[PDB]
Symmetry: D6
Subunit: 160 residues, 12 copies
């Protein structure tokens, strides 16, 4: 009396991907040319972007979809329990990509402004960003659904 979750996991799998692809190369596609810095110093743009955007939300999402898609195809051609090792792996990767945002970004809510004091740059500067609100709104979805996929995966891994 379970495995409603298998549905919801396929549902939210296709969800995540549709949610991704539509806004995917549509939102952050301009996330280099809209990163003003109130200076004239060359390169400080690139430096500060590197400091405060090692990676975009969308890439880390992408890999999260992969490593969470891997147990599906891994377990598909697994013969021709040995079933829940996959499922536990699927938990821990998901939880990983969750934790890494809670580290790298200041807890999801992107700032309209940041500051930057790296090398080529003279001192503190004031580098703006595009659409911080927007992307944050998308994050709320991805992270919510992530928590759902976890929680159900947890519940249905709890079957002896």
């Amino acid at each position: 009396s379970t495995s409603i979750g298998k549905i919801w996991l396929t549902v939210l799998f296709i969800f995540r991907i549709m949610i991704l692809v539509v806004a995917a190369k549509e939102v952050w596609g301009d996330e280099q040319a809209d990163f003003v810095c109130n200076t004239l110093q060359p390169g400080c743009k690139n430096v500060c972007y590197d400091h405060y955007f090692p990676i975009s939300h969308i890439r880390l999402w992408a890999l999260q979809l992969i490593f969470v898609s891997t147990p599906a195809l891994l377990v598909a051609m697994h013969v021709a329990w040995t079933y829940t090792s996959s499922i536990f792996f699927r938990v821990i990767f998901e939880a990983a990509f969750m934790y890494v945002f809670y580290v790298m970004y200041d807890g999801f809510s992107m700032q309209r402004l940041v500051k930057c004091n790296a090398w080529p740059c003279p001192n503190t500067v004031d580098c703006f960003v595009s659409r911080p609100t927007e992307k944050t709104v998308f994050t709320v979805f991805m992270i919510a659904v992530s928590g759902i996929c976890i929680l159900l995966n947890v519940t249905e891994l709890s079957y002896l």
Copy 2:
């Protein structure tokens, strides 16, 4: 003696999507680089765009298509009434994405001009926009069809 509506809902489903995709990455695709502001202040462009375009019409449409597409695929693989819970959900989401425009945007008719008085910006400014007429015209379609999908969904949910 009903379920003509099922047709019209598939019809308008494919409609919405065709209507979307054609103008989709074709109209708002330039909705960052055509957002002049009559200043020289850096970043005020991005700030004001964020203030008056949290999200574009097209994204919120996109999600509206998803959450209204979800009861279709949800109910498809629902066994292998428990039929109209889906339908009611399909109502309330639709009505939601309707209401949220009537809030966030000043009632569909986008202005050729706006003003903006946020922080980095000195005072009131005058930031223009591209093609406000055009997009508004597309909104009239999306919102009209939304109202249709609602109204029929309402009528055919009224079957005991």
Copy 3:
């Protein structure tokens, strides 16, 4: 002894679409960045473009293809006369999108130059356009074929 027209309507349907897609995002794809205005005033470009291009020929074509494609798919899944209501609808929409050009544009022949006296703009100005000849040539095709689809639809609706 009729219904040669059904062929010609499918023929010209596929025609319109091929004619569209090839020049589609290929011709007007630059119809924002090639709209010079002999001033220095900011935004007057966008304003005047909005005044004299509410919508491009290509969008209105696109919708015309949709609402003329709708009776095909509407009538396809119409059971599982009640046949010519569709056909009459197909007439009136076509005629509509015809009339609306004869209004909005100064009778198809686009001008190399226009003038503009809207608000942000100081006075009369002189805003040029790209490739007015070209697009006009495409219009002659779309409008011609439109008239054909009408005329045949009229003739074959004249069967008691």
Copy 4:
């Protein structure tokens, strides 16, 4: 003892299209932003381009492919001689699109330079062009193959 030509016509049909699509949106895709004019006058670029490029080679090719593709699909669903009317039509359209180049362009060899004396422009000017050699080379192919398709179509229309 004929109809080797039917092969060669399909061969060269697929040829023309492959030849087109590869260089299609790859060569003239920059044929607006590389049309320097040695002035400072606004708009004179657009004016002179309009005067000396009503339409590109690639569009007229495209339509030529259509109206030469039409007898194929026209004659396919022609029942469910009345065969060579199509073929003659296929001749005359081909010959048309040939003649129109020999008019509109100064006999295929595009000039590195042209001159222009239209209205907004003060006097004679000197507007350059991109890659005139290149496109001309492609023309030699399209026009050659056009002549082949004609010549064979002529020979095999000569069967009583």
Copy 5:
């Protein structure tokens, strides 16, 4: 019982000149490079300046000082009545340079803005000016003192 005026005329002579030279090459010295026109059209600046500043107030003042200084030096070395012919000449020249302002300029009060519709320029434009208030204030002095020099010259020419 007269010829207090001779004093006042020398007084106001030295006055005019001091008033001139101090603001002379100090005020209108920038009266070419501060004549913005809200266009991008070349030369329209020079054209419109020529149309609405044939000559500056300061030049016409300068000549007025000369032709009013000439009777002084003319009459000085006049022997080695034949005295009031000079004086009458001194009246009429003064009155001349007065009248010519009341013609050429719109009655002293210079406008912050003007318009211009000459040849090279497309249409009406909006060309600003520097410091219209300021120069007008100086005019009030020059014109006032001019009227004084006249009025006294008139009174003391009224001696039989």
Copy 6:
């Protein structure tokens, strides 16, 4: 037992002039090209400068020197009391040019920043100024010495 003041008046006369000429065309000589306004709107610079600098301190000083120099030369060639009418005139002009600053400028201390909401300008703007501190410091001298010249002129006009 007086007329020490005659000395001090010549002293401060030569003073004012030396003080003037040294900083004269040396300080405000750049008081047009250093009047930034944080916009892109043409002309708003000139408009706002006109609104908040009808005349510079230095011009009004200059005239004040003239009209206070006039009683010296007026009274010099006054014969070939009738002495203190001049002196009283010298008071009232001085006091005039004092009062007019206390009106036109916001009480001597020039602001680093001002605002401006005139016509061509969209809204409130933020136009900076050069060296407000500096010029203010010079004003303290001119105004101080003005008060001295008054006060002594008052005391020595108080001789029956």
Copy 7:
């Protein structure tokens, strides 16, 4: 005891194409906007590019793939020896597109710099290029594989 080569020819056919498409519109896609010339003269860029890049390596490759693909599809529908005429044609075209590089380009190794002395250009100039190393590296592959396809085609045409 042969026709291992048929495999290798299909292998290298798919190879060439994969090798092409990946770097295809990815490498030379910027081969107009990265063609600096150390001047200010207009158009000299386009002129010199035309002189030293009539056609890119990638186009001539593309056609080489076509005319070498033609004997495959030509010989496929050749009935419903007369087999090796195709094969010899396949040799000579391949060898042609080889020879034409050895002419038009200075023997594959593209120079970081070139010079140019055409008409609009004043004299010798110094026009740089993007990524000459890179593209050359790709050429080594295409040309190598070309030589392989030849050599095997030669060997297996040597079967009586």
Copy 8:
């Protein structure tokens, strides 16, 4: 008791490709226009980019995927041991593309800054780069998985 590896090799094959294509034309797609050099010298950008980016990581990856994909399709149509020659080839190519990075790039960790002293360039300069962190992170994946594919290929080639 082996050939679990065949799975993992298909798994990581599809992995590499998904990992590639998503970030493929998405990350280095701007790896020409974001290569600032703190000079004004023309071309020095292109020169230095050529010196320190002969080829991008992504191209060499691409070819590595090809030459490692070739034994799959080579061995597929190999009949209609002679099995492990392919496998050994698959080892050595992989190891090659590994070694070549350890040469050409300074051991994976890309520098935010580099220097450059080539010809057109005057002296040492300071040319920045975009997103060095990011791409390096992707390298860690590609190189890791490369090592895995090697190591398993090694282990399963060790079967007598």
Copy 9:
């Protein structure tokens, strides 16, 4: 009964010079930086200015003042008729500098616009000028007074 003219000649001598010096380095002082040409071609400005302004009115005036001043100082220290040789020289030089304007300039009235077709310049161009009206007005004075000095010099040379 003559030699009123000697006065008028000194009068107009001092006149010419005062008239000169005031407007001298005040009017044509900007007669290089206000010589727009509606192109982008380098140098064409200088070329066309050279073609249509070999020398300014003011220089040729200057020399005319010299060579007409020379007989004054020549004849002053001429001993320690032999008087009218000087006077005749003074005629012919004056008449010379008159004639040379009637040649070099198109009869005094300077054009707001000219054209130019010299070498570096591509074709006919349209080079504007500053203040053509103004300078022409000054010419009317210089040329008038020149004619006066001639005419009187003629009359008083007519004394046996």
Copy 10:
């Protein structure tokens, strides 16, 4: 047995003035347009210049020359001890203008660089200066000679 100093004071008076006037409007004459600030923020230049250059060395020198010249002319026309009051005044003013530099400037040695954190400016910035070495060298002279004039004035005021 004294009043060698009277000589040295006239000597150094003429000295100071010659030293001034030569470098006077020759050195700091560009001390507005050479005050770079490594930003793009408008006005921050003017603000920071105001903060770190209230007044230039040259102005304060100028006034110091005046108020030290005043006892000369004051004492000249002092009758038609009452001699050393002047001299003491001459001490204290000199010492004043000395002290005020030791306050306002960081002890004469001007820095090549400064920083600035005023209002319109975002944060700390880095505003350079022209020729700090040079002007400092001139200061060493002015300040040295100032100390001399003091010291001698002190010694010769020490005469009972």
Copy 11:
């Protein structure tokens, strides 16, 4: 029976100087900022100007006036023949400054265009000049008068 020449030498002395000073800082005063070079290379302007204008005509004139003025003042205070040593010196210096033009400049007639191939500059370039005609015309005067001063100095040195 000689020493008419002494007059002519004073005459032409004052001549040269008047001729100089009027056009002096009036003609070549812009002979740095009007020295276009059709490149973008920095500094090549300065280099080429240095190569083809070591010194201007006006400086060498100036020194020529000095060293030819020196025998006047040298011989004035020469006591409190020993007269013609001066005169011969006056010859040879004059002849020197003549010869040096005939060397350094290509025989007086300045070219509208020159070329330049110095170091920082890539190759031959095309650097224009301002007003070559004009200055040449002035040279004709200076050189003519130089020849006169020589010739008379020669004749009057021929007195035993």
Copy 12:
């Protein structure tokens, strides 16, 4: 039997000054705005100019004229040997200003190019200069005459 030198010293005194003033504010007057540096780094211009032009030749000349003029006026009012102390001072100052050039500048011959590696600047750069030849030529005069004034001063100080 001496004191010919007194003449030559006055001669060369007036010489130096004439030589100075003519080229004085005429040559180095542009010696800030013509100091290109082949970078984009802000301020590096000012830094490098400061490093390689602490002071111009003309200033140090100026002071040299002063301190060599001081013994003239010092010795003039020296009473109302004690004569040669002045003369020796006049030697040593002259020799000083000579030595200081031989230090600060690389032995008179200014380089067309220099290099610079100061702080704000990234590395070695290449900063050009204006008219190095020219100024060097003037130096040859000033330094020559300096040596003359020394040598004669030495000889005539050698009188017991």
